[PDB]
Amino acid sequence: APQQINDIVHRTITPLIEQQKIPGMAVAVIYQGKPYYFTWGYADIAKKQPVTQQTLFELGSVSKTFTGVLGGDAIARGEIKLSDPTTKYWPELTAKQWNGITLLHLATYTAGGLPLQVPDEVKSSSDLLRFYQNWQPAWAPGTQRLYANSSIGLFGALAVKPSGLSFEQAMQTRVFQPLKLNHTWINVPPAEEKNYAWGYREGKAVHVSPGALDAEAYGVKSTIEDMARWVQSNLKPLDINEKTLQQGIQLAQSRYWQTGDMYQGLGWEMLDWPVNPDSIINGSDNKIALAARPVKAITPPTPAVRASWVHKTGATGGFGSYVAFIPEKELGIVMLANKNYPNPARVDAAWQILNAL
Amino acid sequence: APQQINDIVHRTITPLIEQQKIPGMAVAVIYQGKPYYFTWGYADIAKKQPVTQQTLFELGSVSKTFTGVLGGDAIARGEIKLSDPTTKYWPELTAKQWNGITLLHLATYTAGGLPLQVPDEVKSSSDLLRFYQNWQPAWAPGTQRLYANSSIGLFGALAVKPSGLSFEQAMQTRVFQPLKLNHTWINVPPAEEKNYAWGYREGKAVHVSPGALDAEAYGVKSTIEDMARWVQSNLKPLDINEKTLQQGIQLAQSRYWQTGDMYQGLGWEMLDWPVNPDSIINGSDNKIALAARPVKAITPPTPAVRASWVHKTGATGGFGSYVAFIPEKELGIVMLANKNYPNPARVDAAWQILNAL
């Protein structure tokens, strides 16, 4: 680890952890293409287990970059089209509303108001179908962005339908595997239970709860080393072999919509680089991030731009994560914690390290 | 040349030739990746110069494919965006109508009615400026497809604006060169003069006349060997060294609009495969080909599909050409003639062969 890196790291993360009261944290820095790992604290507080590079953390919403790529793959494979209507994959989706609602809308929260979370009462696929059928939109599709699980989640489920595979089976075989994402799970196997960190909420050890469209919207668990690869991959997709995956990645970072200085990709989110840290930091605020905003459509879209600050935050009840990278500079970082803490906090920490280069 | 290539070729072309009365022709077939050339008659009748595979032909509208790839390149280069307004690149293009006219519109003949041809009285950049200032649309941008030189021609001129290069310089350096098209010209160098075929029209030997936007709309001259390479490339853009050329290519075969069973790409046209010969044969007729047609917007577009029938016809006063390939089959063909003869004749001929495999 080059000093300068170690430096900004200690400088930056130590206070974050102390301030936020974070139990365990793992950090990776991709500098000029190479990763540098940092670890601190506890995965299991009472069992005194440390956070190692093999520690699995709940990525929460970071899962969405996965789902977005997996769908970019499906596109690249010719199996689906963003331009297709939802009903084409869910025939029984008879409601009119569904009319002009495309895969694209689902994928980018522009469907006109689908809910952030899927009701906890919705258990069966059946429940699920009532749910979607009975939903009426507030806006015209493609007019306003409203971050929602029930949206990109549905997109996930459907995007794998042609493949004949289960969401998780496609993910595995289509992304993890090819990428050597050996310790990435939707479901964590017994073999890895020992490495599965505990989330902490109000001082209680906790694990993501089960719910509809979870795998798709927030079910991925990973290690920093994996997240590191995840980063390199996304940083330089041209280097991956699977042609479809390689294309998928690029599709996920293409710009489909604009809202302010942000661009909505598939799963991912981008801003031009050089960025204005404010925008990023403050924008991370759920008060902004979770809000309903009017979108500008990019017709036709702008393919993945090298000069962007690409990134994503995610949270579960006991975990908080963040990802970001500058494709043009071959630089990025990944931060995973067993505590859900203020986003803005995560992004600023991110901004210091990276800004220090 | 495997027999059943030579066969179907002789079987099909030889007659075509007799039938249309074509003075010289050159054909190439791409089979399983490899190319196979066929030659016939003369290039220079009077002089009795045989068509060779070093013989240059005016591709007319086939140029447009080059224009399209050059165009997708520039976008891969972050140099331009299809979603941007024309005025952005030609600021003096102030008239209202130009309003919501994007580069996309321009590249795809979807601007609302620009004329097929640029009046020949239009000589200066000035003349050119009046022309477009005074042009009044027949429809709203993005509603109708109307094949046009003045459309894609301007797309080509502007797309190179930011690179600072002349249209030709950019093409040479950006496209011809990296592909090794050593005998492809917009303007023919003296040393190539002796290999440059004459066109024949009404028993007259003729070469394309100069015109505004000619380079961009129909200015290239090429050989079959080169055209071959052109074909291969297009068949497997993923093999191109140049990242931006490589993307440009796949950008040029993305589906932006649909009209009938056809999809408008950049320069290129495509249909799914298996294709219906009728539709392709009959569509090739100018009565249809040059007719406005309502387009359906592909939102967002469909990235290049491998199972497609991709092609383009082209002509100048004394030459007729055609190209078609099936990326999924590693199959394609090129027909170059020193005479402009019925397109449907070209498409059928082409179909026969490709259909034979």
CA–CA dist A252, A66 (Å, integer): 9
CA distance between the termini of chain B: 13
Extract the tokens encoding B355: 């259909």
User: Is there a contact between B71 and B159 (Cβ–Cβ < 8 Å)?
Assistant: yes
CA–CA dist A29, A18 (Å, integer): 20
Run of H or E including A68 = helix A63-76
Q: Is A302 on the interface with B (CB under 8 A)?
A: yes
Structural Rg of chain A based on CA atoms = 19
Orientation angle between helical segments A243-252 and A224-235, nearest 10 degrees: 90
Bridge partners of B206, per DSSP, are B199
CA–CA dist B322, B27 (Å, integer): 10
> Structural domains in chain B?
1-357 (3.40.710.10)
For chain A, breaks with the C atom over 2.5 A from the next N come after none
- CA-based nearest distance A81→chain B, Å: 7
CA–CA dist B17, A192 (Å, integer): 71
Extract the tokens encoding A89: 């994959």
- Which residues in chain A have their CB less than 8 angstroms from residue B295's CB? none
CA separation (Å) from B285 to A157, B170, B350? 44, 32, 15
Run of H or E including A224 = helix A224-235
CA–CA dist A42, B122 (Å, integer): 76
Alpha helices per DSSP H over chain B: 3-20, 63-76, 86-89, 103-107, 125-134, 149-159, 167-171, 177-179, 190-193, 214-218, 224-235, 243-252, 277-283, 286-289, 343-356
Pick from A83, A298, A305: CB nearest B298: A83
CA–CA dist A244, A251 (Å, integer): 10
Residue A78: count other Cβ atoms within 10 Å of its Cβ: 18
User: Is there a contact between A353 and A333 (Cβ–Cβ < 8 Å)?
Assistant: yes
What resolution in angstroms does the PDB record give?
2.0
User: Is there a contact between B8 and B356 (Cβ–Cβ < 8 Å)?
Assistant: yes
Run of H or E including B29 = strand B24-31
CA nearest neighbour of A60 among A209, A193, A183, A166: A209
Q: Compute the CA torsion angle B201, B204, B207, B210 (nearest 10 deg).
A: -80
Extract the tokens encoding B348: 């059928």
Q: Is B243 on the interface with A (CB under 8 A)?
A: yes
User: Is there a contact between B24 and B337 (Cβ–Cβ < 8 Å)?
Assistant: yes
Contact B303 A256 (CB under 8 A): no
3 state SS of B346: helix
Contact B301 A306 (CB under 8 A): no
Amino acid identity, residue B335?
M
Contact B247 A83 (CB under 8 A): no
Extract the tokens encoding B188: 């023919």
Amino acid identity, residue A208?
V
Strands across the sheet with A319-326, in order? A49-50, A34-44, A24-31, A331-337, A319-326, A308-316, A269-272, A262-264, A255-259, A296-302
Extract the tokens encoding B37: 């050339």
CA nearest neighbour of A234 among A308, A168, A159: A308
Contacts of A285 (CB under 8 A, 6+ apart): A343, A344
Q: Is A340 annotated as a binding residue?
A: yes
CA nearest neighbour of B158 among B98, B95, B74: B74
CA–CA dist B309, B328 (Å, integer): 9
CA nearest neighbour of B204 among B62, B57, B46: B46
- CA-based nearest distance B305→chain A, Å: 7
Beta strands (DSSP E) in chain A are: 24-31, 34-44, 49-50, 57-58, 144-146, 199-201, 204-206, 221-222, 255-259, 262-264, 269-272, 292-294, 296-302, 308-316, 319-326, 331-337
Q: Is A195 annotated as a binding residue?
A: no
Bridge partners of A302, per DSSP, are A255
Contacts of A268 (CB under 8 A, 6+ apart): A64, A65, A68, A234, A252, A253, A310, A311, A312
Residue of B80, B83, B244 to mutate, interface with A, max A Cβ within 10 Å: B83
Run of H or E including A303 = none
From the annotation, which residues of B make up the binding site for a beta-lactam? 61, 117, 147, 149, 315, 340
Active site residue B63: no
* Residue in the structure block whose two tokens are 């952030």: A116
User: Is there a contact between A218 and A314 (Cβ–Cβ < 8 Å)?
Assistant: yes
Alpha helices per DSSP H over B57-189: 63-76, 86-89, 103-107, 125-134, 149-159, 167-171, 177-179
User: Is there a contact between A86 and A97 (Cβ–Cβ < 8 Å)?
Assistant: no
Extract the tokens encoding A284: 């991370």
CA distance between the termini of chain A: 13
CA B322 from chain centre, in angstroms, equals: 9
Q: Is B164 on the interface with A (CB under 8 A)?
A: no
Extract the tokens encoding A44: 């299991």
Q: What angle do CA A260, A261, A265 make, to 5 degrees?
A: 100
* Residue in the structure block whose two tokens are 């289509």: A174
CA–CA dist A219, B19 (Å, integer): 66
For B21, how many CA atoms within 13 A lie in the half-sphere containing its CB?
5
- Which residues in chain A have their CB less than 8 angstroms from residue B247's CB? 303
Contact B78 A306 (CB under 8 A): yes
User: Is there a contact between B199 and B317 (Cβ–Cβ < 8 Å)?
Assistant: yes
Residue B199: count other Cβ atoms within 10 Å of its Cβ: 24
